[PDB]
Design a protein around this nucleic acid. Structure first.
Ligand code: MG
Length: 580
DNA sequence: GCATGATGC
DNA sequence: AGCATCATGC
């Protein structure tokens, strides 16, 4: 039974009501400078479909879009906000975003269209987007009659679903999470994405040029040491050369064949000169394919800017993800790749890159939630926690902890945050399970509060059905009751880790909101460019650096008050690389 | 389409 | 070993 609506040829006052479900359709997955395919409005006066050329050309409609007192309910308002920024139009008054509401209620649903969100509440009078647009080569906007009905049905679903979603969020104590954290953050992310990050493409091409020389040399060498040529990127090919031709030990059997994972090659290095070369070629190869070629593919030719899209409704812990390009996984560990960062520069003359990062926020969050006296005292003294953990588990004074002891204690700290298991630690440290179990037992002896939290959080997940973070984000863990040990253990690890990684996500998100408000009050020209889990990257006039040095760390450190202090380090320079 | 293996925090 | 995205091979 088709849905009734007015396919309007011009905007009417009836369509500019104080509250409405609004759909501003952008079908292209990447909405940056993308077309707005159609518009639907549903309010007390009825259901309307508007052609974009006509609506966005109408001063009253545009004014209505920008009037913050006219409330709109939408699904993925950030997509609309950004598509509109590229057209010079401001969207204001979004009081409810169904995508974010669905995500908070249950991140696992994987809700990515109005249909999926509506199904959560047994509402199925709307089609999935893929059903009407198709996928890939078949993706396409349908003719007006079909397009118009789909947008109206989506707007109708949003109009109908807003109350039940808000009611459940309030029952979950997530009402403020949506209205005071995620929705305001959505606007900040739209600004970041729209601003983009300037790329020195010439520097990138230079690098790409040199990289190509090195790759050839390492490749030729590999063929030499191999006795002949083969596809170094072909797993099969590599495995035959390594384990058959060269007779290297197979101390890790892949499904049916051999493993050439990094740690395995790392273990075989001692046996043959070719292994070191293979790992280096993989290193350089990743730089070339993803951080040079792949990057250059998404840089805008006119402005030389890259505009990522932060997916705010994807991760199971509350973190953001970044795509096209992923600006959250730019190399930094190895110097060769870290240089890629020299290509990320300020967007204006005489501006600089400013980077601020939390120091051990996960462990500090753990100290707070576990209320472990020893861990809390360590952060109160601002000690190096890895040296401190080594001192405690290996029972030695600071003077006697060796580099090897610190390295292993650090690995224990990682395991504790990830959700500890003797096998996971054994694998990471390349030791036996019993030895790893011993390290863990000694850890819990020194940090009994943490031990109690890990036991308690697992029982709680079992009792309630989910775990939560500081700001009430939640994650259901059905598998925690599974009778399969491996399946149950993965859930137990999630129970242990989620509240830590998730609360750290909550904190930095609130810091971003607090920071922008401070930035605005001060009328500073500085603005956010990126967020990479526990760090914020901005660019600003060189004349604002001194102010930023005091402002950013303070806002980040004060975003939330924990039982231990929060500490933020910062650096700035002429490129992202120099912001160290 | 999925596995493998790289990158980040 | 927790959470992610991208390029490649088959
Ligand atoms: Mg850090």
């Amino acid at each position: 039974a088709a849905m009734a609506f007015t396919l309007a040829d011009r905007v009417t006052e009836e369509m500019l009501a104080d509250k409405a479900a609004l759909v501003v359709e952008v079908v292209e997955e990447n909405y940056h400078d993308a077309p707005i395919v159609g518009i639907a409005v549903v309010n007390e006066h009825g259901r309307f479909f508007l052609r974009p050329e006509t609506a966005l050309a109408d001063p009253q409609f545009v004014a209505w879009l920008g009037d913050e007192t006219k409330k709109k309910s939408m699904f993925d308002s950030k997509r609309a906000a950004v598509a509109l920024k590229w057209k010079g139009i401001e969207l204001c008054g979004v009081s409810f975003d169904l995508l974010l509401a669905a995500y908070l209620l249950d991140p696992a649903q994987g809700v990515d269209d109005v249909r999926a969100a509506a199904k959560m509440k047994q509402y199925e009078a709307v089609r999935p987007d893929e059903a009407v647009y198709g996928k890939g080569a078949k993706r396409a906007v349908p003719d007006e009659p079909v397009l118009a009905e789909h947008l109206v049905r989506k707007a109708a679903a949003i109009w109908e679903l807003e109350r039940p979603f808000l009611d459940e969020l309030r029952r979950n104590e997530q009402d403020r999470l949506l209205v005071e954290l995620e929705q305001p953050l959505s606007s900040i992310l739209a600004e970041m994405e729209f601003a983009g990050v300037k790329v020195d493409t010439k520097r990138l091409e230079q690098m790409g040029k040199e990289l190509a020389e090195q790759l050839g040399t390492v490749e030729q060498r590999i063929y030499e040491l191999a006795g002949q040529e083969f596809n170094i990127n072909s797993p099969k090919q590599l495995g035959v050369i390594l384990f058959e031709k060269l007779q290297l030990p197979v101390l890790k059997k892949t499904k049916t064949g051999y493993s050439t994972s990094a740690d395995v090659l790392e273990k075989l290095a001692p046996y043959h000169e070719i292994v070191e070369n293979i790992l280096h070629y993989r290193q350089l190869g990743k730089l070339q394919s993803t951080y040079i070629e792949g990057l250059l593919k998404v840089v805008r030719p006119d402005t030389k800017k890259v505009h990522t899209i932060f997916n705010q409704a994807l991760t199971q812990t509350g973190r953001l993800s970044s795509t096209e390009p992923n600006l959250q996984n730019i190399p930094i560990r190895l110097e060769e790749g870290r240089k890629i960062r020299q290509a990320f520069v300020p967007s204006e003359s005489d501006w600089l890159i400013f980077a601020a990062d939390y120091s051990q926020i996960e462990l500090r969050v753990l100290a707070h939630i576990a209320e472990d006296d020893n861990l809390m005292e360590a952060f109160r003294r601002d000690l190096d926690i890895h040296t401190k953990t080594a001192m405690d588990i290996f029972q030695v004074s600071e003077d006697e902890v060796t580099p090897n002891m610190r390295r292993q204690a650090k690995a224990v700290n990682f395991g504790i945050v990830y959700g500890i298991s003797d096998y996971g630690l054994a694998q990471n440290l390349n030791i036996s399970r019993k030895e790893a179990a011993e390290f863990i037992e000694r850890y819990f002896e020194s940090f009994p509060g943490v031990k109690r939290y890990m036991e308690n959080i697992v029982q709680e997940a079992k009792q309630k059905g989910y775990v939560t973070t500081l700001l009430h984000r939640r994650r259901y863990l059905p598998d925690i009751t599974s009778r399969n040990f491996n399946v149950r253990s993965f859930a137990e690890r999630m129970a242990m880790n989620t509240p830590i990684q998730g609360s750290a996500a909550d904190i930095i998100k609130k810091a971003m909101i607090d920071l922008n408000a401070r930035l605005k009050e001060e009328r500073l020209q500085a603005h956010l460019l990126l967020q990479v889990h526990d760090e914020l990257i901005l660019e600003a006039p060189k004349e604002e650096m001194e102010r930023l040095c005091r402002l950013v760390p303070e806002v980040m450190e004060q975003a939330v008050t924990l039982r231990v202090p929060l500490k933020v380090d910062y650096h700035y320079g002429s490129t992202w690389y120099d912001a160290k």
